Swiss-Prot record:
Listed name of the protein: Neutrophil collagenase
Protein localization: Cytoplasmic granule; Secreted, Extracellular space, Extracellular matrix
Recorded superkingdom: Eukaryota
Family indicated by similarity: Belongs to the peptidase M10A family.
Tissue expression as described in the entry: Neutrophils.
Residues involved in Zn(2+) 2 binding: H112, H116, H122
Species of the source: Homo sapiens (Human)
Active-site residue numbers: E113
Residues annotated to bind Ca(2+) 1: D52, G84, G86, D88
Binding site residues for Ca(2+) 2: D69, G70, N72, I74, D92, E95
Function, in words: Can degrade fibrillar type I, II, and III collagens.
Swiss-Prot/TrEMBL domain comment: The conserved cysteine present in the cysteine-switch motif binds the catalytic zinc ion, thus inhibiting the enzyme. The dissociation of the cysteine from the zinc ion upon the activation-peptide release activates the enzyme.
Whole-protein coverage range: 106 to 262 of 467
Binding residues annotated for Zn(2+) 1, in chain numbering: H62, D64, H77, H90
Amino acid sequence: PKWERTNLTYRIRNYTPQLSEAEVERAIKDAFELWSVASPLIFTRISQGEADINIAFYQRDHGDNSPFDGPNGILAHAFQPGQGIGGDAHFDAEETWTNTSANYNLFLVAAHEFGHSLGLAHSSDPGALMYPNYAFRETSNYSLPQDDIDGIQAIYG
Ligand SMILES: [Ca+2]
Ligand SMILES: [Ca+2]
Ligand SMILES: [Zn+2]
Ligand SMILES: [Zn+2]
């Protein structure tokens, strides 16, 4: 699965109250930019209406047959490129969401989920963003690990 348009829209449908709205918006924007700088994709935010990629914070059963599980465990999930639910990214509202090294950093989690939104599966490289399990990495000048660059380059050339 892969997108056939280069300019994709996204919409943040709701917000965790644990971060300022500005910090939620910056986490999401920066997570998309990680992939944009390694691909031809251009991400465009809309405030209402139907976007290619919906982003939301939900708890437990939330209408897609993949319920969240409360604190810890599954932090978020995302759907492969396609119409409707395709591309969408959901975050477990019951987590602690941070902009620090404390569990769990929203920017890093979003970055992983957006890999799925663009067509990547999990990686077996423990250093890869797309590794199945979360590990905090310094965020200040974070760039995609080389394994993830390889992955998105394989899809979008
Ligand atoms: Ca959870
Ligand atoms: Ca969608
Ligand atoms: Zn979901
Ligand atoms: Zn994943």
